[PDB]
Structure 1
Amino acid sequence: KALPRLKQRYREEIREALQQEFNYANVMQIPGVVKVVVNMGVGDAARDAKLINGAINDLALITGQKPEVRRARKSIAQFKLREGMPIGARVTLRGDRMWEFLDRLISIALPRIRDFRGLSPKQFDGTGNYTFGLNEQSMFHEIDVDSIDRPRGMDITVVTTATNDAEGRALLRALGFPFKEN
């Protein structure tokens, strides 16, 4: 009875546009976004685990889902890290949660991006993938700026079903992220 505007968009207009613009043999060659990944590894828990709790608090308030933290999958003396210390916080999505969060992000954080300049095609990998790292956490609405103690990191990435980068870029710009003009 309730469902996200991007879900509808995908069903009716994005799918039709991509089909027309690439002449797929079948309807569903249309790649579809698979997983929005939201993790973080500070690397500072090796000296103090207090900041990890705050980062997870930010992740929970941003998502409402309870992020996990992983240990030192290997151990490195140079990084002063031993296996078993928690360094990486994760929080994942799927489906309606994926696209509600994506709509909120596109509507709020992107126009809210200080000195926003658009994102380039070239950080793809040719297989329809898209991932990079957030300047600052404070960009988000539900988070409180008066309570942020130290500027820490967040990431909410997107992925595709695209076989190559061509379809990935086509559908992604159809969704309408701010690609550069070069």
Structure 2
Amino acid sequence: AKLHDYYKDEVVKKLMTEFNYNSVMQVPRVEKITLNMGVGEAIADKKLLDNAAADLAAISGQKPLITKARKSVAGFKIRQGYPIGCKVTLRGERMWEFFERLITIAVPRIRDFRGLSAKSFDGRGNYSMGVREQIIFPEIDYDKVDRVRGLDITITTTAKSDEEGRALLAAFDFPFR
């Protein structure tokens, strides 16, 4: 809610002024934040997937969805419908709380943080970033890590351009290099 309140009170006014929008509905909102773990090694052992899910659950606060292979792929030795990943979709209050926890805590705790890339937009105002270790989230205990395990965050936006996209995140002081 902190950053949701900050969005409504402060960010909307910045983006209105910046882009000279007619309507307030023309301002970029943050739609959702999808955390994904590709757990391709789980073909060997399903316990790793369970542990991966448990980590993503701790980070997010939601029980994750176990994703599965859209098709068989011989390169990675996966058949169709084999569980090879897991995701959480964060929307609303939980999204904003996570987005706080990411910016204020987790991103600082990245090893050798020199800003996030500003060229990591899809072309349609959505931002994606790799987390390389689950240690950056304090929710994970450092002691009980079986394997070091990253996840990809994606912040989906109602921004049309990347300029609108980056401006929105920049208004939250999203740490861009």
Instruction: Pick the TM interval, shorter chain.
Output: over 0.9
Aligned 8 A contact 1:126 1:166 in 2: no
Output aligned runs, 1:21-170, within 5 Å.
21-170=18-167
Change (3 A) 1:111 1:28: same
Structure 1 runs, 4 residues or longer, greater than 6 Å off: none
SS at match of 1:111: coil
Contact 1:65 1:91 in 2 (8 A): yes
> What is the match of residue 19 of structure 1?
16
Q: Which of residues 171, 175, 178 in structure 1 aligns to 2:175?
A: 178
TM-score, normalised with respect to structure 2: 0.95
For residues 68 and 145 of structure 2, the distance between their equivalents in structure 1, rounded to whole angstroms, comes to 25
TM-score (normalizing by structure 1): 0.92
Distance in 2 of aligned mates of 1:163 and 1:113: 30
Identity of aligned residues (%): 59
Aligned alpha-carbon RMSD (Å) = 1.2
Structure 2: segments with no counterpart, 5+ residues: none
Gaps of 5+ in 1: none
Per-residue deviation at 1:7?
A: 1.2
- Distance of 1:163 and 1:156 partners within structure 2: 20
Q: 1:25-73 deviations in whole A, cap 9, x for unaligned?
A: 1222101000100121211121111100111111122222111212221
May I ask how many residue pairs the two structures share in their alignment?
177
- Assess if the C-alpha contact under 8 Å between 2:38 and 2:84 holds in 1: yes
